[PDB]
């Protein structure tokens, strides 16, 4: 009941998601800390490096780990944060923060805390101005995921809005530029700003619409601010009086038309003397990125599960 | 350039079309007071009577001609008011009631007067008891002719939650239950609500994607609220729309199967709905090539 | 404790409320189900004086009667399913119009056929003007809303077509016995939107607290999500919202004058409707109705 | 008249105001090239150093002067982005920002460009760390100044959401900190985030409240969206937005509360926080006297 409309888009994925995807992962299951069996193995299920390796595939062979260990720890606490109260999430999360920036060395008994004061050491030891070009809005991701505006009234305009931040779209494209060794100057990013919002609307509706019954669920069992239901499916099925199924196959024909509108732009970025080679590089990337999100999305598991 | 996506639903005109279509369209050229012989040219060639035709293709065959006229004079008078003031339009639309009720006798100077009351009158020598439940949905869209809407802050749910209660598809829907001598009960019509407001956004929305080029000119229209809330073009907003209603059209039918799953669906709700479905597919053909929206 | 700001509006309560109450509750008890109850606490007929202070003193019984009964519906129609009550209701509706005849051994059918038959006996022409009103109201009653993402201006909207404050209108005519044309039942349009969002804002106002028992969909929720304030903040400034609405119907009024003249109907009844705002708060603040 | 409502906050003017504006004022009166005298004349008496000395009543005596300097500099220029196109517009304030940084050499022949470099100089020279502290905060507003304005369906939630995170209020605090030599931590200031948010929030409607009718001659404002939502006149909805100032005033006062009660309320916290509360009278004097909102 859920054809994908056609797209112009063909994902791409990393030649080394083999060898990436086995040492992370490896290393989650080795550091962090398990409920049970059941757990580490819906892990190993999600494949959240081969996700990484779908968003990044012109990633440098040695900078495409350090994104696969940072994509995987945050859906990692993602899903923790959904049993938390926003308060509690945000406590969570704010512990982390300075943690991220290396201001304050983890209790090496908790392993939320070093994996993630490694990570970003690892990062920052292999390029340290790209490194702290993440920090921000990964910083600006955490915050918004128990944000009060997660349960006041929100039409569809509102809420791509504040999914844009609940997405992380920042911190995946500078994670992106990590990676591809993508140096942008300030004005170069100024420049795409229209196209970094229009992706981001895209990832956000694409994973809103594989994402929503896993999310249906932790709605009815997980914490009642932390497992709130806040996503495009559920709004435009209340707006229009549709099925939620009905409502998944309106939004994606809706991201065919932020797909038209990426090229639309990216033809008028080049159109006017702006495309530069770096940024060439960068908006074709944001295109992997739609792409491998959407096809992560139709086939991991994390997605079709109790 | 803008492509229907598929649907499983059909345009269908009634039978009779080309026969009732003279009847009402010569009575209002001897009767209604066109200006000149151009405006008279142009009222033939919209056929008012053939769009009625496609929305209610389902009319009985001697009760469809007074869907026709009324529909004719309602556009006619729609048509007429915009060339006059709000107070005036109210008021000449309201001294127009008592008159389509019977209790006030008309000067048969004044053309929409006696053709009111004569076609009123008409109505209920056919069908009293039909004939008086479709005079309250005629006044509430006449008195809705003339009023204004006064903006506000409006998205996507909201926009569509008060198409859905429009009067102008609410006459539609009664007017075709008098056409078809649908006599439902208020248990029979409580029953349909979902199913009619399911239909009153799809054929609000159809008419907002075709009518969208007219009205951008110089303000609320699906079209204009998806586009800025999606941020792309109105172009974009209404292909996304278009799939939207084959949603209702989707919804509609399970709709339709759930009633009936039930012990619930009626010869006449079974009749009713279907009347539906060709207002829907009816509409989009008209929004599809009315001069309406043209230019 | 929450000091409502300045209003120009004085509440009034009909002279007769006190023959009234005895009566229509004396009646109720006398006939009613619903076992224990506090029924004669329950203002019903004494707030049906608070709204409609000048109705006229033969029909003002009329009023509460059809308001009790109503209520008491309501209240019953708790305990069954959105269509165990649909049906419930539907099933007064002819007997109301009078077609259908009442099982005399069954309270709320005679009791409503009684009551119908005795307002077209006083007065056929209104009684029958507010079938439609009634029947709304009680369609209205068990019916359900889908939920929608809803902002204030929303959900201000909605209440300005509240069926129920519609019902307090058409009834506060009939029991006044002010009868207007179309044409004033069109120039008062804005008035009554007006004051239907105010009966509203201040029933929300002082039930906040009993209905956060719990979904809401309330303006002082509402208020204090989008403006980030407590729920104490959001009744304070809807307060002040409510008393601009006053202020608003003052207008409205004194502009209706000024335009093609009132009518003596319509300062009438315009009127009326100012004592069912000042009588709707006079009643918020003091009905066990929203007691915790 | 409004007659604003009673608040527990009042208005303060930095003590050195009077020496700060002349020197101020002097500078840019000899160094900026104004396009006549009508222009200087205008520029005295709209006072931008009297301004910031009523934003910031509490900033340090030694350093009050850069920031009137730099609001005086990003104002005037202000003013002037609006005489050019966004292109023009913003690569005018991109020229600038390297050169603010001090890593590109200012042409001494153009007075905007080497106002800028000494002033972010002087400033780095009396406090680096500081000074680096708020060229970001600056930047983002130099950018936001030639933005382009999203036009969507938008209430009051959605528009007070987005004013919580206003540039200019952002580089308000910034630069407030940066006068009161209040060395911050990312920690404390996070502690502070619903402070800001609601501040904020206050500071812009406050702005809308007053800046209205001139407005009045794409309207993006509190007045008009709460005034068509409760559909009352802009002037009752000023009244509704005054009472919502207080009660954010009143939030405030809470906020700090709970700040202190759960012991996490430093000494440079206790600063900031009052600092805020007279950016809120500071503001709302300000906005009740500027010329700006004349017509
Ligand atoms: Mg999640
Ligand atoms: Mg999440
Ligand atoms: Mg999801």
Redesign the pocket.
Known sequence: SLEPPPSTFQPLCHPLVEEVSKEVDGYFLQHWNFPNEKARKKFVAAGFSRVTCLYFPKALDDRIHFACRLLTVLFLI?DL?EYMSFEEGSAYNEKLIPISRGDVLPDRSIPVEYIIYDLWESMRAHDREMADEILEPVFLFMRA?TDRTRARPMGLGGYLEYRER?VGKELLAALMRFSMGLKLSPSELQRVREIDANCSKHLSVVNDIYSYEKELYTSKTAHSEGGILCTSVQILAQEADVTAEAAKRVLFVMCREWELRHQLLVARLSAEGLETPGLAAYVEGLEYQMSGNELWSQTTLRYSVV
């Open positions: 993602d944060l995921q609940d």
